[PDB]
Amino acid sequence: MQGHPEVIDYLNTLLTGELAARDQYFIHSRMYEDWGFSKLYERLNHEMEEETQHADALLRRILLLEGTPRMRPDDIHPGTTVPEMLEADLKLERHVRAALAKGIALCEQHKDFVSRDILKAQLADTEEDHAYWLEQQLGLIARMGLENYLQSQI
Amino acid sequence: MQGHPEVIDYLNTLLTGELAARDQYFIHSRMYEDWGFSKLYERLNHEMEEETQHADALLRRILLLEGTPRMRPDDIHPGTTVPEMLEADLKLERHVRAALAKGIALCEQHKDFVSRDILKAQLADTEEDHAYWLEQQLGLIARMGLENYLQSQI
Amino acid sequence: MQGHPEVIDYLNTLLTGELAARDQYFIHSRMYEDWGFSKLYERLNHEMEEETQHADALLRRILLLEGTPRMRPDDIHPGTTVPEMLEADLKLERHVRAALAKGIALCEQHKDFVSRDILKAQLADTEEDHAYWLEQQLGLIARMGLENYLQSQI
Amino acid sequence: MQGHPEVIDYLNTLLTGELAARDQYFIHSRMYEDWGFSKLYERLNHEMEEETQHADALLRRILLLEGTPRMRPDDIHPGTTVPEMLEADLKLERHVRAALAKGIALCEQHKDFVSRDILKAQLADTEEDHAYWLEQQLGLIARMGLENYLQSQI
Amino acid sequence: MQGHPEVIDYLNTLLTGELAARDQYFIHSRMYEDWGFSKLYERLNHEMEEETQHADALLRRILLLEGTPRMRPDDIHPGTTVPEMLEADLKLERHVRAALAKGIALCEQHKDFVSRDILKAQLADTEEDHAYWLEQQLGLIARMGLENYLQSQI
Amino acid sequence: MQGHPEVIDYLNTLLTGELAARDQYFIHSRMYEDWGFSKLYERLNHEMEEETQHADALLRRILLLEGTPRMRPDDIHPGTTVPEMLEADLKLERHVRAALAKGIALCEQHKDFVSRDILKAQLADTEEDHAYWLEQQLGLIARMGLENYLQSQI
Amino acid sequence: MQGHPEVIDYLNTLLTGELAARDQYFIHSRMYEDWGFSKLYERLNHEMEEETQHADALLRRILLLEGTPRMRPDDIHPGTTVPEMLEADLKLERHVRAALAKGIALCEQHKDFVSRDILKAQLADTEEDHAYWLEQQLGLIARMGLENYLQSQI
Numbered sequence A, B, C, D, E, F, G: 001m002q003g004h005p006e007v008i009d010y011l012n013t014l015l016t017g018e019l020a021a022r023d024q025y026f027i028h029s030r031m032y033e034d035w036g037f038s039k040l041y042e043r044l045n046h047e048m049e050e051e052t053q054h055a056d057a058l059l060r061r062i063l064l065l066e067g068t069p070r071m072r073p074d075d076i077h078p079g080t081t082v083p084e085m086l087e088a089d090l091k092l093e094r095h096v097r098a099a100l101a102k103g104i105a106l107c108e109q110h111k112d113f114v115s116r117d118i119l120k121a122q123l124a125d126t127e128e129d130h131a132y133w134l135e136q137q138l139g140l141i142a143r144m145g146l147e148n149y150l151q152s153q154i
């Protein structure tokens, strides 16, 4: 079934963004492990798998709609310290959140309700799981201090 | 069996107080979880269930005594930080403690010994479980500092 | 992430309504049990738990959106006989249904699609589970008579 | 193997009748459930599955005999109340019974003994299971009254 | 709860379409089995069950909304060869897809968000399961030839 | 119990025909295995066992009726290639089908209803299992070509 | 421990190549599934996981050696048909093979024997698993024809 060219293009924009999110969590999780923070490694490794699934859902939907997926990831922007890395992932998730919301609006306008639902599932993941967890870590650092927070992530 | 109107009225006062305790633990537990303190969430979520059972015991006893339960909760007074929330719950439990003790005295005076025993069970919970645990947390903050205490509640 | 103030306010209106639904089922279920209708007790006790979960979902979403939840329940309006209690719960659910539908429209307008989905889940529960079951009981009373219906709920 | 054109045509008449029986039980069972009579729902849902199997046996036999099955169901005639629905299903089963008996006679005449046996299996189901159960329900309503009968089907 | 007459009417249009889809898969699956293609039989038998569930969801929703379901299936249009049957089912699913999308738009307009969600679930099934699988089979025939494809479906 | 001499004689005719069917499947199944088509071997080996049981039922019935069974099999007519062997077994089953139908008519005429039922069971096996499967194989060869069909039977 | 800058740079070149291999298998596997070749989907999905592990081993080794991993994947070059996709993956694996062999030589020269061993493990995977399997598929297409080969991958 041929999708609407505007929806396919916009799914392709989301796809290169999810491929990038996957890669930024790839490097941050391994950096965390390199420093001995295994709890941060585990969480961001898990989030890398989750972004791979988000990318996979977009890719498959684009193929079903007879589009050609764009496989070049967006640039990533890794941090160099634990607070910079948390902030960099939160900025990325906020960008994804905004992009998914605009995508849902576009899908509704072009009456592509299944693509809309696929983006809504990812939006809920972005807001209630990925971004929220990051806001919490930054909040924890603010409440107990960075040293105590890092101790808790060994 | 018709209870004494003074006992029924006083059980109704305790009931609106327990409905309020339930609700104050509802909001504090979720605030704790919002900030990433899952151990505080778990404990206050558990205490919300316990106040619901205390409310339930009062409600059922009022119905057995052919009274009409008053279902409007007392106002709650949530805190805005972990130490304010602990202090606010301790103040509420101290109020409940005093109210239950006065109720036991009233039940004894009106020779309603089963209602007295129901309040005694709740009084033991209030003093030895709910209030004591709160005093302990505040004591811990005083002994290791707030930052260390918060770290321990992640 | 800061939610839209209009959405947060409206979620807060829904929250005080769910806290009230929870409490009206609290008292009706116990009244049913007081009279010996254990099947009505079981169903409304189950519905009290369900409204507590609906309230919980709203409360958590409001906190995620950086709002302050309003914990005062709306007034309840319990019945005094089995048909009045069924009618009173149906009137409450119809009110909730209308309020949730208006909320979904508001969330769509402010492009808060995750809050919309949370309300849609609750709307489906309200229409297809809570309100429908009540309409059925009233329908049963109409078809076999109140005496037979009450016999069936022992 | 080419069947006798008269037998194939007559199997096709039975087939559109079974497709209709399936559909009339589809709607009646769901109407019963809509009203809260789950025991009537369960029985007629089960009978819908049974008519689907009766239809399936006829359809497959028609294909084996190199005919073309007629898939348009006969008109159905649902009732609007429990006694009308029982009467409407009994009238349909009595019609099926008569049609199957005439079919068995036709198959015997054209020496199609396997098609005869397939109709005999369905005739036994129609008389001893479907129609009999309906006659029993109507008999029960007559003996204990409609209100008591409906109570028993919740 | 009385639904909007325009939504009820449109659900009734979808219902007669699902009853038809169920019946077209009924006959095609049995034709496939008659020819010895058991893998096609299994898949279309499974899809017949799925359309029966789609019909059932619509029927129940119409009853909940106090409408009267229309139980006459749309005409079906079975093929006479494996490629015609695949094409005929794909044409039917494309028609259903378009009809469901228009229905979702109508439900949104009349603020019937639960009926909208029921259609969205069916739309996802239609696009991502039923229609996609058909497009794949036709694609396979194009890539390996009809003879090889038929061999693979024994 | 002495059977009718005409029925006994006719059962004896069917018996020598079943002994022959058993033997023709004996040789064809082993020829299929000799060539490496193990799926054809398995099916015709299974059908040899089934004809042995059909023969056994006739033999025992003849003895019960105090007749003397005729144990000389009819001549068989094996094919020399897979399509000739399928055609030769289909011709044999069509002959058996016709002979069983005439036998059922004869049994009905002589009011030997148990012998009739024994032949009806075998007739259903002949039409719906043995002959149908053969027609299907020949149909498959016609649809995918003989080479592909043979590949599928390895 | 600081690695040799020339080795770190060369590991970084291999890393962007493995990230690309991972992505080319990502898209090809999903394209294969889109067309209904589930065996090709399964194999290339498995190879995507394997390249992710190869990338992960390089990334971690670069961090251990105190380098900064380069996370931008090389360009990929997906095919548009099954033979083009197989050829495109074989060309990529041949490039990886050559790059790994040059890397092993470089590591030996700089006496980084553990990095050498990590590349040797990946080289064995590339030659004996990934590239060999691709050569086999192309060989199969050449021996039985593309149509038969595609049939075998459903």
Ligand SMILES: [Fe+3]
Pocket: A046, A050, A129
């Ligand atoms: Fe997760």
Ligand SMILES: [Fe+3]
Pocket: A046, A047, A050, A129, A130
């Ligand atoms: Fe997660």
Ligand SMILES: [Fe+3]
Pocket: A018, A021, A050, A051, A054, A096, A122, A126
């Ligand atoms: Fe994502």
Ligand SMILES: [Fe+3]
Pocket: A050, A125, A129, A130
């Ligand atoms: Fe998640």
Ligand SMILES: [Fe+3]
Pocket: A021, A051, A093, A096, A125, A126, A130
């Ligand atoms: Fe994310």
Ligand SMILES: [Fe+3]
Pocket: B046, B050, B129
């Ligand atoms: Fe406890």
Ligand SMILES: [Fe+3]
Pocket: B046, B047, B050, B129, B130
């Ligand atoms: Fe406790």
Ligand SMILES: [Fe+3]
Pocket: B018, B021, B050, B051, B054, B096, B122, B126
């Ligand atoms: Fe208490």
Ligand SMILES: [Fe+3]
Pocket: B050, B125, B129, B130
């Ligand atoms: Fe306790």
Ligand SMILES: [Fe+3]
Pocket: B021, B051, B093, B096, B125, B126, B130
């Ligand atoms: Fe307490």
Ligand SMILES: [Fe+3]
Pocket: C046, C050, C129
């Ligand atoms: Fe429930």
Ligand SMILES: [Fe+3]
Pocket: C046, C047, C050, C129, C130
């Ligand atoms: Fe419920």
Ligand SMILES: [Fe+3]
Pocket: C018, C021, C050, C051, C054, C096, C122, C126
């Ligand atoms: Fe609710």
Ligand SMILES: [Fe+3]
Pocket: C050, C125, C129, C130
């Ligand atoms: Fe529910």
Ligand SMILES: [Fe+3]
Pocket: C021, C051, C093, C096, C125, C126, C130
């Ligand atoms: Fe509710």
Ligand SMILES: [Fe+3]
Pocket: D046, D050, D129
């Ligand atoms: Fe049955």
